[PDB]
Amino acid sequence: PFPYAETDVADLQARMTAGELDSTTLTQAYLQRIAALDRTGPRLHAVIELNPDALKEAAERDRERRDGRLRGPLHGIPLLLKDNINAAPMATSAGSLALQDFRPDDAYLVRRLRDAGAVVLGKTNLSEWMNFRSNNSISGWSARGGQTRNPYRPSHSPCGSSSGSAVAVAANLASVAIGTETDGSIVCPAAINGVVGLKPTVGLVSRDGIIPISFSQDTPGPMARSVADAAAVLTAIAGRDPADPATATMPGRAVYDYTARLDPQGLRGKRIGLLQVPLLKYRGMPPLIEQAATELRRAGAVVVPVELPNYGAWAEAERTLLLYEFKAGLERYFNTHRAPLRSLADLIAFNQAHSKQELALFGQELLVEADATAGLADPAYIRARSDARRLAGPEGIDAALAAHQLDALVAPTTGVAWPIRPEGDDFPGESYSAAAVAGYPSLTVPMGQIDGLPVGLLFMGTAWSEPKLIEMAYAYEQRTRARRPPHFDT
């Protein structure tokens, strides 16, 4: 029995405050569990690199605690970081062999987490290049990290690209983790691995020190077994950073503790739109989404059916903006952090020179396509960026919210995990693209399982609605508690 299985941040903090546990002992527990499950047994491959300073940091936090000098709710809490997020002295590789020895200084959000007292356990594997390398890619695979596996059923996909962070949290390999989303990359693997994932409004959390895809859509976000844990993490990482102009665009930026929004009455009087989307009829879904609507109502919410007409009509425009933004953003990142690659051409050339190890399972067609883009002054890009955002936000989520005076929209996040195959992902559908493309907050909470595989309930709101989304998600979670632990089905 793993003694800290399913234990919240608040409870770990309580055990430490009482002296029954400390950071060093807790960190040792996770390290030993990683040793037992990650590259042997079920071979989850969630962790791409351990932090050589993890135990040094744990010991520092415990020494501080013994002097009665705490940093807050995350003091001594071990967590994992997706390996597109800079954190010394580890590499930040995006899963690529080209960056296996590239060890840039801490990302802004990592500096914040460390000052908050969190212990960085290590980095987690991801779909190589945040799944922007090929349309034939296999989710959760990278050359440097191998194949991340779903702990519910290790033959099946963890989704991604925040694959290792989702898996690690679900399998109790750390307390909490950080992921990043461009479109789906937090909430998809969170849902698929039966955990909570929160993708904030773009700009709430700094993107500085993260290997980027999209200035318009990218955001880091917390991944955790519970909403309370996710809220604690968000409190620590939210804030303005002059390095990231997107964080200057937040109106009424105020010091805010999101754990104050953990109200079991948080759904009373709320109005929720149940999105009329194809995933409602996904095989096995109707009983779950029906039960979820019912539980929302039992918690005191009003739940009404709502359309988001032409859901996905931004797809073409989004693909275009991502290609352009990936080239421009990556090349800027490589320059800023003095990486050993400086261009997308360099990366493409590296991969061909290392084809046996990098290109054996699938190609790099999307890298090539992005590299072909003329740059950010192309009016085609400008129009695509503007169109995608307008369709998904003002004309999508906002129009639906306004027309029915709603606080949030909900839908099943995605379908269930699919077999890991050389052919690449057999993707079932999504309801998270609107929020990702709008740059608006979304949050997935476990709502049950189909055939023993987790499914999530996705909440979405307008820009800067995280406090309210968190209240509503928490109130839902507390009366359902639909997460079950994985048990590594064969």
Coordinates of C-alpha atoms in Angstrom, one line a residue:
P1 CA 0.0 0.0 0.0
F2 CA 1.4 3.4 -1.0
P3 CA 0.8 5.5 2.2
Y4 CA 0.4 8.8 0.4
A5 CA -1.9 7.5 -2.3
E6 CA -4.7 10.0 -3.1
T7 CA -3.6 12.4 -0.4
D8 CA -4.3 16.1 -1.0
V9 CA -1.8 18.9 -0.7
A10 CA -3.7 20.3 2.4
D11 CA -3.5 16.8 4.0
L12 CA 0.2 16.4 3.2
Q13 CA 0.8 19.8 4.7
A14 CA -1.2 18.9 7.8
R15 CA 0.9 15.7 8.3
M16 CA 4.1 17.7 7.9
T17 CA 2.9 20.5 10.3
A18 CA 2.1 17.8 12.9
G19 CA 5.6 16.1 12.4
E20 CA 4.4 12.7 11.2
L21 CA 5.9 13.4 7.8
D22 CA 8.5 15.8 6.3
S23 CA 9.5 16.8 2.8
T24 CA 12.6 14.6 2.7
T25 CA 10.7 11.5 3.7
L26 CA 7.8 12.3 1.3
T27 CA 10.3 12.9 -1.5
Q28 CA 12.0 9.6 -0.8
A29 CA 8.6 7.9 -0.9
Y30 CA 7.8 9.3 -4.4
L31 CA 11.4 8.5 -5.7
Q32 CA 11.1 4.9 -4.6
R33 CA 7.6 4.6 -6.2
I34 CA 9.0 6.1 -9.4
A35 CA 11.8 3.5 -9.3
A36 CA 9.2 0.7 -8.9
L37 CA 6.7 1.8 -11.6
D38 CA 8.4 4.1 -14.2
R39 CA 11.0 2.0 -16.0
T40 CA 10.0 -1.4 -14.6
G41 CA 6.7 -3.1 -13.7
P42 CA 4.1 -1.3 -15.8
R43 CA 6.9 0.9 -17.3
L44 CA 4.9 4.1 -17.2
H45 CA 7.8 6.2 -18.5
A46 CA 6.2 9.3 -17.0
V47 CA 9.5 10.8 -15.7
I48 CA 12.1 11.8 -18.4
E49 CA 14.7 13.2 -15.9
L50 CA 14.9 13.2 -12.1
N51 CA 16.1 16.4 -10.4
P52 CA 19.6 15.7 -8.9
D53 CA 18.8 18.4 -6.3
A54 CA 15.3 17.0 -5.3
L55 CA 16.5 15.7 -1.9
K56 CA 18.8 18.7 -1.3
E57 CA 15.8 21.0 -1.8
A58 CA 13.5 18.7 0.4
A59 CA 16.1 18.9 3.2
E60 CA 16.3 22.8 2.9
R61 CA 12.5 23.0 3.2
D62 CA 12.5 20.7 6.3
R63 CA 15.3 22.7 8.0
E64 CA 13.1 25.9 7.4
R65 CA 10.1 24.1 8.8
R66 CA 12.1 23.1 12.0
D67 CA 12.9 26.8 12.5
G68 CA 9.1 27.7 12.2
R69 CA 9.6 29.5 8.9
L70 CA 7.1 28.3 6.3
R71 CA 6.6 29.6 2.8
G72 CA 2.9 28.7 2.5
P73 CA 0.7 25.8 1.4
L74 CA 3.2 24.3 -1.0
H75 CA 6.1 24.2 1.5
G76 CA 8.0 20.9 1.0
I77 CA 5.5 19.6 -1.6
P78 CA 7.2 17.5 -4.4
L79 CA 6.0 18.2 -7.9
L80 CA 6.9 17.4 -11.5
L81 CA 7.3 19.7 -14.5
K82 CA 6.6 18.9 -18.1
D83 CA 9.9 18.9 -20.0
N84 CA 9.2 21.9 -22.1
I85 CA 9.5 24.0 -18.9
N86 CA 12.9 25.3 -18.0
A87 CA 14.2 24.2 -14.6
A88 CA 17.9 24.1 -13.6
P89 CA 19.9 21.9 -13.2
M90 CA 17.8 19.6 -15.4
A91 CA 17.6 19.6 -19.2
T92 CA 14.6 21.0 -21.0
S93 CA 14.5 18.8 -24.1
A94 CA 10.8 18.8 -25.3
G95 CA 11.5 15.1 -25.6
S96 CA 14.2 15.6 -28.2
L97 CA 17.7 14.1 -28.3
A98 CA 18.9 17.5 -29.8
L99 CA 18.3 19.1 -26.4
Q100 CA 19.4 16.3 -24.0
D101 CA 22.3 18.5 -22.7
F102 CA 20.4 21.9 -22.8
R103 CA 19.9 23.1 -19.2
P104 CA 18.5 26.6 -19.2
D105 CA 17.7 28.7 -16.1
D106 CA 14.3 28.3 -14.3
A107 CA 11.1 29.4 -16.0
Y108 CA 9.2 32.2 -14.3
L109 CA 6.6 29.9 -12.9
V110 CA 9.3 27.6 -11.6
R111 CA 11.0 30.4 -9.7
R112 CA 7.5 31.1 -8.2
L113 CA 7.0 27.5 -7.3
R114 CA 10.4 27.2 -5.6
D115 CA 9.9 30.5 -3.7
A116 CA 6.5 29.0 -2.6
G117 CA 8.5 26.1 -1.1
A118 CA 7.7 23.3 -3.7
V119 CA 10.3 20.7 -4.3
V120 CA 11.0 19.9 -8.0
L121 CA 11.1 16.1 -8.2
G122 CA 12.1 16.2 -11.9
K123 CA 10.8 16.5 -15.5
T124 CA 8.0 14.6 -17.2
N125 CA 7.9 13.1 -20.6
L126 CA 5.8 14.6 -23.4
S127 CA 4.8 13.9 -26.9
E128 CA 7.9 15.1 -28.7
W129 CA 7.8 18.8 -29.6
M130 CA 4.4 19.2 -27.8
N131 CA 2.9 17.0 -30.5
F132 CA 3.6 19.5 -33.3
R133 CA 6.1 17.3 -35.2
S134 CA 3.8 15.1 -37.3
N135 CA 0.1 14.4 -37.9
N136 CA 1.1 10.7 -37.7
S137 CA 2.5 11.0 -34.2
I138 CA 2.0 8.7 -31.3
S139 CA 0.8 10.6 -28.2
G140 CA 3.2 10.3 -25.2
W141 CA 6.2 9.2 -27.3
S142 CA 9.5 11.0 -27.4
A143 CA 13.0 9.9 -28.5
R144 CA 14.6 10.9 -25.2
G145 CA 11.7 9.7 -22.9
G146 CA 10.4 6.7 -24.7
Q147 CA 6.7 5.8 -24.6
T148 CA 4.6 7.1 -21.7
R149 CA 1.8 4.7 -20.8
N150 CA -1.7 5.1 -19.3
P151 CA -1.6 3.7 -15.7
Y152 CA -5.3 2.5 -15.9
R153 CA -4.2 0.2 -18.8
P154 CA -0.6 0.5 -19.9
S155 CA -1.2 -0.8 -23.4
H156 CA -3.4 2.3 -24.0
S157 CA -2.5 6.0 -24.6
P158 CA -2.0 8.6 -22.1
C159 CA -2.9 11.3 -24.7
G160 CA -0.7 14.4 -24.4
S161 CA 1.3 16.4 -24.9
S162 CA 1.5 16.7 -21.1
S163 CA 1.5 12.9 -21.0
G164 CA 4.0 12.3 -18.2
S165 CA 2.5 15.0 -15.9
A166 CA -1.0 13.4 -16.1
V167 CA 0.3 9.9 -15.7
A168 CA 2.6 10.8 -12.7
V169 CA -0.3 12.5 -10.9
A170 CA -2.7 9.7 -11.6
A171 CA -0.2 7.1 -10.5
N172 CA 0.8 9.0 -7.3
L173 CA 4.4 9.6 -8.5
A174 CA 4.3 13.1 -7.2
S175 CA 1.9 15.3 -5.3
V176 CA 1.0 17.6 -8.2
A177 CA 2.5 18.5 -11.7
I178 CA 2.6 21.2 -14.2
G179 CA 1.6 20.8 -17.9
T180 CA 1.2 23.1 -20.8
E181 CA -1.6 23.4 -23.3
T182 CA -1.7 24.8 -26.9
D183 CA -4.9 22.9 -27.9
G184 CA -5.9 20.0 -25.5
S185 CA -2.4 19.3 -24.1
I186 CA -3.4 19.8 -20.5
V187 CA -7.1 18.8 -20.4
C188 CA -6.9 15.8 -22.8
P189 CA -4.3 13.8 -20.9
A190 CA -5.8 14.9 -17.6
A191 CA -9.2 13.5 -18.6
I192 CA -7.6 10.4 -20.2
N193 CA -5.7 9.6 -17.0
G194 CA -8.5 10.4 -14.6
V195 CA -7.1 13.6 -13.0
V196 CA -8.0 17.3 -12.8
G197 CA -6.4 19.6 -15.4
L198 CA -6.8 23.4 -15.5
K199 CA -5.9 25.4 -18.6
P200 CA -6.0 29.1 -17.6
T201 CA -6.8 32.1 -19.6
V202 CA -3.8 33.0 -21.8
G203 CA -1.9 35.5 -19.8
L204 CA -2.8 34.5 -16.2
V205 CA 0.5 32.5 -15.9
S206 CA 3.7 33.6 -17.6
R207 CA 4.9 31.6 -20.6
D208 CA 8.5 32.7 -20.0
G209 CA 11.0 29.9 -20.0
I210 CA 8.7 27.4 -21.8
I211 CA 9.5 25.9 -25.2
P212 CA 6.6 27.4 -27.2
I213 CA 4.2 26.5 -29.9
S214 CA 1.8 29.5 -29.9
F215 CA 2.1 33.0 -28.3
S216 CA -1.7 33.2 -28.9
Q217 CA -2.8 29.9 -27.3
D218 CA 0.0 28.5 -25.1
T219 CA -0.4 28.4 -21.3
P220 CA 1.0 26.3 -18.4
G221 CA -1.4 25.0 -15.9
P222 CA -1.8 22.6 -12.9
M223 CA -2.5 18.9 -13.1
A224 CA -3.6 17.2 -9.9
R225 CA -5.8 14.4 -8.5
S226 CA -8.2 17.0 -7.0
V227 CA -9.5 20.5 -7.7
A228 CA -8.2 21.8 -4.3
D229 CA -4.7 20.7 -5.3
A230 CA -5.0 22.3 -8.7
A231 CA -6.2 25.6 -7.0
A232 CA -3.2 25.6 -4.6
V233 CA -0.9 25.3 -7.6
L234 CA -2.6 28.0 -9.6
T235 CA -2.3 30.4 -6.6
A236 CA 1.4 29.9 -6.6
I237 CA 2.1 30.4 -10.3
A238 CA -0.4 33.1 -11.4
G239 CA 1.1 36.6 -11.8
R240 CA 2.4 39.3 -14.1
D241 CA 5.8 38.9 -15.7
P242 CA 7.3 41.7 -17.8
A243 CA 9.1 39.0 -19.9
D244 CA 5.7 37.8 -21.2
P245 CA 3.5 40.7 -22.6
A246 CA 0.5 38.4 -22.5
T247 CA 0.5 38.8 -18.7
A248 CA 0.1 42.5 -19.0
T249 CA -3.3 42.1 -20.8
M250 CA -5.1 41.0 -17.7
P251 CA -7.6 43.6 -16.3
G252 CA -8.0 43.8 -12.6
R253 CA -4.9 41.6 -11.9
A254 CA -5.1 41.1 -8.1
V255 CA -3.4 39.0 -5.5
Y256 CA -5.8 36.0 -5.3
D257 CA -5.9 32.7 -3.4
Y258 CA -7.9 30.3 -5.5
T259 CA -8.3 27.8 -2.6
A260 CA -10.8 30.3 -1.1
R261 CA -13.1 29.3 -3.9
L262 CA -13.3 25.7 -2.6
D263 CA -17.0 25.9 -1.6
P264 CA -19.2 22.8 -1.5
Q265 CA -22.1 25.2 -2.2
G266 CA -20.3 26.5 -5.2
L267 CA -22.9 25.4 -7.7
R268 CA -26.0 27.0 -6.0
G269 CA -27.7 29.4 -8.3
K270 CA -25.1 28.9 -11.1
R271 CA -26.4 28.5 -14.6
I272 CA -24.6 25.9 -16.8
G273 CA -25.0 25.1 -20.5
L274 CA -24.6 21.5 -21.4
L275 CA -23.0 21.7 -24.8
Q276 CA -24.8 19.9 -27.6
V277 CA -21.7 18.3 -29.3
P278 CA -20.9 15.0 -30.9
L279 CA -19.1 13.6 -27.7
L280 CA -22.5 13.4 -26.0
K281 CA -23.2 10.3 -28.2
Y282 CA -19.7 8.8 -27.9
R283 CA -20.1 5.1 -27.2
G284 CA -20.8 4.7 -23.4
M285 CA -21.0 8.4 -22.8
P286 CA -24.7 9.1 -22.4
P287 CA -25.1 7.6 -19.0
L288 CA -22.1 9.5 -17.7
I289 CA -23.0 12.9 -19.1
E290 CA -26.6 12.4 -18.0
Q291 CA -25.5 11.5 -14.5
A292 CA -23.1 14.5 -14.5
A293 CA -25.9 16.9 -15.4
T294 CA -28.0 15.4 -12.7
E295 CA -25.3 15.8 -10.1
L296 CA -24.8 19.5 -11.1
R297 CA -28.5 20.0 -10.6
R298 CA -28.4 18.2 -7.2
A299 CA -25.7 20.6 -6.2
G300 CA -28.1 23.5 -6.9
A301 CA -27.1 24.5 -10.5
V302 CA -29.5 25.2 -13.3
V303 CA -28.4 23.1 -16.3
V304 CA -29.8 23.8 -19.8
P305 CA -28.9 22.4 -23.2
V306 CA -27.0 24.8 -25.4
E307 CA -25.5 24.9 -28.9
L308 CA -22.2 26.3 -29.9
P309 CA -23.0 26.4 -33.6
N310 CA -20.3 25.4 -36.1
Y311 CA -18.1 24.1 -33.3
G312 CA -14.7 23.6 -34.8
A313 CA -15.1 26.1 -37.7
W314 CA -11.9 27.7 -36.4
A315 CA -9.9 24.5 -37.2
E316 CA -8.3 25.7 -40.5
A317 CA -7.4 29.1 -39.2
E318 CA -6.0 27.6 -36.0
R319 CA -3.8 25.2 -37.9
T320 CA -2.4 28.1 -39.9
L321 CA -1.7 30.3 -36.9
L322 CA 0.0 27.5 -35.0
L323 CA 2.4 26.7 -38.0
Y324 CA 3.4 30.4 -38.2
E325 CA 3.7 30.9 -34.5
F326 CA 5.7 27.7 -33.9
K327 CA 8.5 28.8 -36.2
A328 CA 8.7 32.3 -34.9
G329 CA 8.3 31.4 -31.2
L330 CA 10.7 28.5 -31.3
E331 CA 13.4 30.5 -33.0
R332 CA 13.0 33.4 -30.5
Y333 CA 13.2 30.9 -27.6
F334 CA 16.3 29.2 -29.0
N335 CA 17.9 32.7 -29.3
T336 CA 16.9 33.9 -25.8
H337 CA 18.1 30.8 -24.0
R338 CA 21.2 30.2 -26.2
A339 CA 20.1 26.7 -27.2
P340 CA 22.4 24.5 -29.3
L341 CA 19.8 24.6 -32.1
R342 CA 19.0 28.1 -33.3
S343 CA 16.4 27.5 -36.0
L344 CA 13.6 25.1 -37.0
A345 CA 15.9 24.2 -40.0
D346 CA 18.6 23.1 -37.5
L347 CA 16.0 20.9 -35.7
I348 CA 14.8 19.3 -39.0
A349 CA 18.5 18.8 -40.1
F350 CA 19.3 17.2 -36.7
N351 CA 16.3 14.8 -36.9
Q352 CA 17.4 13.6 -40.4
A353 CA 20.9 13.1 -39.2
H354 CA 19.5 11.1 -36.3
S355 CA 16.7 9.4 -38.3
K356 CA 17.2 6.0 -36.7
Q357 CA 16.5 7.3 -33.3
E358 CA 14.2 10.3 -34.1
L359 CA 12.2 9.3 -37.2
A360 CA 11.8 5.6 -36.9
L361 CA 8.1 5.5 -35.8
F362 CA 6.9 8.6 -37.7
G363 CA 8.1 11.7 -39.5
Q364 CA 8.5 15.4 -38.9
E365 CA 6.1 16.7 -41.5
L366 CA 4.7 19.5 -39.3
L367 CA 8.2 20.9 -38.5
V368 CA 8.8 21.1 -42.3
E369 CA 5.4 22.8 -42.8
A370 CA 6.0 25.3 -40.1
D371 CA 9.5 26.0 -41.4
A372 CA 7.9 26.9 -44.8
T373 CA 5.8 29.7 -43.3
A374 CA 6.9 33.2 -44.5
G375 CA 6.7 34.8 -41.0
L376 CA 4.3 36.9 -38.9
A377 CA 4.0 39.7 -41.4
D378 CA 2.0 37.5 -43.8
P379 CA -1.5 38.8 -43.9
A380 CA -2.7 35.2 -44.2
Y381 CA -1.3 34.6 -40.7
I382 CA -2.8 37.9 -39.4
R383 CA -6.3 36.9 -40.7
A384 CA -6.1 33.3 -39.4
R385 CA -5.1 34.5 -35.9
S386 CA -7.8 37.1 -35.8
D387 CA -10.5 34.7 -37.3
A388 CA -9.7 31.7 -35.0
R389 CA -9.9 33.9 -31.8
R390 CA -13.1 35.6 -32.9
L391 CA -14.9 32.4 -33.8
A392 CA -14.0 30.5 -30.6
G393 CA -14.3 33.4 -28.1
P394 CA -16.7 36.3 -28.9
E395 CA -18.7 34.3 -31.4
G396 CA -18.3 30.9 -29.8
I397 CA -18.0 30.6 -26.0
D398 CA -19.0 34.2 -25.3
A399 CA -22.1 34.1 -27.6
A400 CA -23.3 30.9 -25.9
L401 CA -22.8 32.2 -22.4
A402 CA -24.5 35.5 -23.2
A403 CA -27.5 34.1 -25.0
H404 CA -28.4 31.9 -22.1
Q405 CA -27.0 34.0 -19.3
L406 CA -24.7 31.2 -18.2
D407 CA -21.8 31.0 -15.8
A408 CA -20.1 28.1 -17.7
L409 CA -20.4 25.6 -20.4
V410 CA -19.8 21.9 -19.8
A411 CA -19.1 18.9 -22.0
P412 CA -17.3 15.6 -21.9
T413 CA -13.6 16.5 -22.4
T414 CA -12.8 13.7 -24.8
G415 CA -13.4 9.9 -25.3
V416 CA -11.4 7.2 -23.6
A417 CA -7.8 6.0 -24.1
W418 CA -7.1 4.2 -27.3
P419 CA -4.5 1.4 -27.9
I420 CA -0.9 2.5 -28.4
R421 CA -0.3 1.6 -32.1
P422 CA 2.6 2.3 -34.6
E423 CA -0.1 3.9 -36.8
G424 CA -0.5 6.9 -34.4
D425 CA -3.4 8.2 -32.4
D426 CA -7.0 7.1 -33.0
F427 CA -8.5 10.4 -31.7
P428 CA -12.1 10.2 -30.5
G429 CA -13.3 13.8 -30.4
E430 CA -12.9 16.8 -28.2
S431 CA -14.8 19.7 -26.5
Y432 CA -11.7 21.6 -25.4
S433 CA -10.6 23.3 -28.7
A434 CA -13.0 26.3 -28.2
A435 CA -11.4 27.3 -25.0
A436 CA -7.8 26.7 -26.2
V437 CA -8.4 28.7 -29.4
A438 CA -10.3 31.5 -27.5
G439 CA -7.5 31.7 -25.0
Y440 CA -10.2 31.1 -22.3
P441 CA -10.0 29.0 -19.1
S442 CA -11.0 25.3 -19.1
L443 CA -11.0 22.7 -16.3
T444 CA -11.6 19.0 -16.5
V445 CA -12.8 16.9 -13.5
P446 CA -13.1 13.1 -13.5
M447 CA -16.8 12.2 -14.0
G448 CA -16.4 8.4 -14.2
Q449 CA -15.2 5.6 -16.5
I450 CA -16.1 3.7 -19.6
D451 CA -14.8 0.1 -19.7
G452 CA -12.5 1.0 -16.7
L453 CA -11.0 4.0 -18.6
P454 CA -11.4 7.5 -17.2
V455 CA -13.6 10.2 -18.7
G456 CA -13.7 13.9 -17.7
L457 CA -16.3 16.6 -17.4
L458 CA -15.0 19.8 -19.0
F459 CA -15.9 23.2 -17.6
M460 CA -15.3 26.3 -19.7
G461 CA -15.8 30.0 -19.1
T462 CA -15.0 33.4 -20.5
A463 CA -11.7 35.1 -20.0
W464 CA -10.5 35.4 -16.3
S465 CA -13.4 33.3 -14.9
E466 CA -11.0 30.9 -13.1
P467 CA -12.3 31.7 -9.6
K468 CA -15.9 30.8 -10.6
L469 CA -14.9 27.8 -12.7
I470 CA -12.9 26.5 -9.7
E471 CA -15.9 26.9 -7.3
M472 CA -18.2 25.1 -9.7
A473 CA -15.7 22.3 -10.5
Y474 CA -15.0 21.8 -6.8
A475 CA -18.7 21.6 -5.8
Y476 CA -19.2 19.1 -8.6
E477 CA -16.2 17.0 -7.6
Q478 CA -17.0 16.9 -3.9
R479 CA -20.5 15.4 -4.4
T480 CA -19.3 12.9 -7.1
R481 CA -15.7 11.9 -6.3
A482 CA -15.6 10.0 -9.5
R483 CA -11.9 9.5 -9.7
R484 CA -10.7 6.0 -9.0
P485 CA -7.1 4.9 -8.7
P486 CA -5.5 3.1 -11.6
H487 CA -4.6 -0.5 -11.2
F488 CA -2.6 -1.2 -14.4
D489 CA -5.1 -3.5 -16.2
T490 CA -3.5 -5.8 -18.8

